[PDB]
Amino acid sequence: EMEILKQKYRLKDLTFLLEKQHELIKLIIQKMEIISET
Amino acid sequence: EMEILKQKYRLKDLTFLLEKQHELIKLIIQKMEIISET
Amino acid sequence: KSPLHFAASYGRINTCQRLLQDISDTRLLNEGDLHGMTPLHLAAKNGHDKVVQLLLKKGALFLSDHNGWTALHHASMGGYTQTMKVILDTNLKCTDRLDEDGNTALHFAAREGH
């Protein structure tokens, strides 16, 4: 029981990190030089 | 049993978010200025 | 040559249309990589439906690379059904092909879990 609870808090930080990282990739595509493949 | 089912739905949203994010990184590399390292 | 193998592998369509304005010479379309991979192979491996449709519209001729794979053997390993429809709706010959290890396009679409 203490092992799956430890894995739930590790996965909850994994969802928080990927959601922070998903906002950066949405911001790279938002502010970017697009000339040749326009 | 209710703990692993709760972890399965958290992981199922983790696969959906990473697959959405994998399409953006494939789209950054698709529309990008590449001059110096061509 | 190598600009076309990069621009087709990573879906850059506008770089591909510039490089294929020399369509009187069809050497660079069906050219090979070090693993014998066509630009049609690379565009279907990463799952780019627009690049595989432009290359088929200019005669990519459905070659085979080393290990005997095709564009359909690459599009299946990856589960990209959109480039799979572009290959299948062109001709019905590629869906019955085999590699050197006897696998069809069906065997790669089932092994990876698509």
Query: In this structure, what token pair is assigned to residue B34?
Result: 């590449």
Decide if C15 and A38 are in contact by the 8 Å CB cutoff. no
The answer to whether residue C3 neighbours chain B at the CB level (below 8 Å) is yes
Residues of chain A positioned with their CB less than 8 A from the CB of C51: none
Which among C3, C10, C13 is the nearest to B29, CB-wise?
Answer: C10
State the chains in contact with A (3 or more Cβ–Cβ pairs under 8 Å). B, C
Q: What does chain C come to in residues? A: 114
CA pair distance C86, C4, nearest whole angstrom: 20
User: How far apart, in Å, are the Cα atoms of C60 and each of A26, B24, C27?
Assistant: 35, 28, 10
Q: Summarize the annotated binding site of A as residue ranges.
A: 6-12
The answer to whether residue C11 neighbours chain B at the CB level (below 8 Å) is yes
Name the DSSP letter for residue C57.
Answer: T
C-beta contacts of B2-7 below 8 A and 24+ residues apart: B3/A1, B3/A4, B3/A5, B3/A8, B4/A4, B6/A8, B7/A4, B7/A7, B7/A8, B7/A11
Name the DSSP letter for residue C107.
Answer: H
Task: Give the residue from C38, C41, C10, C8 showing the smallest Cα distance to C26.
Answer: C38
- Residue reference for tokens 């879990």: C113
